[PDB]
Amino acid sequence: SFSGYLKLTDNVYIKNADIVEEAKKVKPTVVVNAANVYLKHGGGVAGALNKATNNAMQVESDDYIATNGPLKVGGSCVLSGHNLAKHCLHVVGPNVNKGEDIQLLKSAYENFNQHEVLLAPLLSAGIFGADPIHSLRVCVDTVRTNVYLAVFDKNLYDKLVSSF
Ligand SMILES: CC(C)[C@H](Nc1ncnc2[nH]ccc12)c1ccc2c(c1)S(=O)(=O)CCC2
């Protein structure tokens, strides 16, 4: 199971950890990917999860987009978790560096409520340009299911916990 997490609320937990390493250790039912609408897993969390699958996540993702078209910002899709989890929930948070509306961050976190328990990153943080403190607050105020957040930066983890 999940270990070494700090409990923030009745249902939100947080740890300073690499989500790829956490997925390989736990093999959760659901791992969330910080996806873009095209499912092009080039960098950040998406690039790291895809590299751990030996590119099998990208091959599956390109077939999904060829059939269905792109996702919406704030939307999601369920695909295989490959060697990392039973399933991967690909969720698109708004990328502020592309001028996407930050209000769509709450819609993105609502996708988590369709799963009883998930391993996830903070949406729209990092190269998506949003304030991580804001992302954690939207997470706690929107997600009702059990979410285990992996934040791979000790300095940011300490700032998130000390300001919570
Ligand atoms: C540095 C943290 C803010 C964090 N990094 C991480 N958090 C957890 N496992 C990780 N493995 C490798 C890095 C990594 C973070 C959280 C969310 C997002 C990104 C980064 S991003 O990939 O830059 C863009 C998408 C959203």
Side-chain angles (χ1 to χ4, degrees):
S1 70
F2 293 92
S3 61
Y5 284 75
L6 169 67
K7 185 171 178 66
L8 295 181
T9 69
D10 176 52
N11 64 299
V12 179
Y13 295 83
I14 194 169
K15 184 180 178 181
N16 175 25
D18 176 347
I19 193 173
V20 173
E21 293 303 310
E22 200 78 352
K24 295 175 187 181
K25 168 189 165 196
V26 177
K27 300 198 183 56
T29 300
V30 179
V31 65
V32 173
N33 180 30
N36 53 55
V37 297
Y38 306 106
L39 301 184
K40 285 301 185 193
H41 310 306
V45 166
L49 286 175
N50 177 60
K51 180 177 169 186
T53 73
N54 183 44
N55 209 51
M57 179 182 283
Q58 188 64 67
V59 162
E60 178 194 31
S61 292
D62 285 345
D63 168 86
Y64 173 92
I65 298 285
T67 297
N68 297 292
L71 279 65
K72 292 172 179 178
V73 176
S76 68
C77 68
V78 179
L79 292 177
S80 182
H82 301 275
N83 56 319
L84 300 177
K86 173 163 193 190
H87 302 292
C88 180
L89 180 71
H90 297 271
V91 181
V92 185
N95 185 326
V96 169
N97 298 317
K98 275 139 215 293
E100 301 176 342
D101 177 16
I102 195 60
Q103 299 182 110
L104 293 164
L105 187 53
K106 190 170 180 72
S107 301
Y109 273 114
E110 289 170 340
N111 294 284
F112 284 33
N113 291 320
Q114 301 291 318
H115 300 280
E116 288 201 339
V117 64
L118 311 91
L119 168 61
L122 287 164
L123 301 178
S124 292
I127 72 180
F128 278 47
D131 179 354
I133 293 177
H134 176 61
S135 188
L136 175 60
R137 182 53 61 193
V138 175
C139 181
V140 161
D141 293 343
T142 306
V143 183
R144 298 177 300 283
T145 55
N146 293 324
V147 57
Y148 289 87
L149 295 167
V151 172
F152 196 29
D153 189 72
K154 178 59 164 156
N155 293 133
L156 173 61
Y157 173 90
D158 288 348
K159 184 180 180 54
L160 286 168
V161 172
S162 72
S163 58
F164 185 66

